[PDB]
Amino acid sequence: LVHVASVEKGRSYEDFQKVYNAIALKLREDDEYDNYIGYGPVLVRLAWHISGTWDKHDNTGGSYGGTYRFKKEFNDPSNAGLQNGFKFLEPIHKEFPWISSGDLFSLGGVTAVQEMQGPKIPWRCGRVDTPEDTTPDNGRLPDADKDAGYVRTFFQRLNMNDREVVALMGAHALGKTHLKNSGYEGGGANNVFTNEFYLNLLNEDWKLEKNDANNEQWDSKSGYMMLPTDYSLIQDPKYLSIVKEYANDQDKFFKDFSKAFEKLLENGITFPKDAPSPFIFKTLEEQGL
């Protein structure tokens, strides 16, 4: 099973920058969502969930086929709440109907990270919409109630190593949990991309509590929360080291996140030798828009 990247016919960097800009402008303008967090965090989560279905063993799942558009994947309980991100992107897709679904969903994530003052994430085009029968079954995204061994084993399926895992988890500095979506409540309503996840892990006083959905989570007096899988990064000696590294080096964290997130979004895709090199998009700020 091979998924070969195929550039949307006749499209070049300038076409994709226009799509980036349309998403970025909407992010700026629809700022009310989720008590003024806006749509950045949910779009990052969407890009991760459409990618996180990949299995390195058979090359099924991943971002290529844009299969979240199909009912089976759209209604996965693990994807509860991501419909808000789908609805955000819908008008954009109507404006630029030439772009594939996988390309749009993944570009949404890249745009969100950059517009939230994160690192630049190189991005490649050419994902191709695949038919409904290529939709992966539910159950491939991870559980939050587990420990460090689970997290490590889970991520081996996505060909991610310890450093890549800890860097990717830094995105949890963004946004919040919603009891109705996942059975967890709380967060920090943050919409700026920083290394604060790692700082909060090391510096807050965490207490284990049972929430109103009968799930255990770690809570701090500052009003923050960690999932059990978040907290596992300071329980495991190998993860802890890396957590300390990112807490003390913002630039390192940005560079490692950029690499891991691009890899996550590209897993399962074969890029021909003639393919364009990755694009790096300018932010609205860089364009004076």
Ligand X SMILES: c1csc(-c2cnc3n2CCC3)c1
In the complex, the residues that contact ligand X under the rule CB under 6 A are 172-173, 175-177, 187-188, 190, 200, 224-227, 230
Would strands 269-270 and 3-4 be described as parallel, antiparallel, or unpaired? parallel
- Is 12 annotated to bind a ligand? Reply is no
- Give the nearer residue to ligand X in terms of CB position, either 104 or 226: 226
Q: How far is the CB of 176 from ligand X (least distance, A)?
A: 5
* Residue 230 contacts residue 143 (beta carbons within 8 Å): no
Breaks in the chain, after residue numbers (C to N greater than 2.5 Å): none
Q: Can residue 265 be called a binding residue for ligand HEM (CB under 6 A)?
A: no
Q: Which is nearer to ligand HEM, 21 or 181 (CB)?
A: 181
Cα dist. 176→14, 34, 38, 42, 188 in Å? 34, 9, 11, 9, 6
Tokens of 153: 């084993």
Q: Which stretch binds ligand HEM (CB under 6 A): 59-67, 173-181, 206-214, 277-285?
A: 173-181
Annotate each residue in 129-158 with x if it binds ligand HEM (CB under 6 A) or - if it does not, as one string.
Answer: -------------x-x------x-------
Residues 68 and 32 sit within 8 Å (Cβ to Cβ): no
For residues 214 and 219, what is the distance between their CA atoms, to the nearest angstrom? Answer: 14
CA 52 from centroid of its chain's CA atoms: 9
188 binds ligand HEM per the rule CB under 6 A:
no
Identify the residue among 184, 206, 224, 231 touching ligand HEM (CB under 6 A): 184
48 is in an annotated binding site: yes
Query: Applying CB under 6 A, which of residues 11, 140, 172, 231 lies at the interface with ligand HEM?
Result: 172
Residue 253 engages ligand HEM in binding (rule: CB under 6 A): no
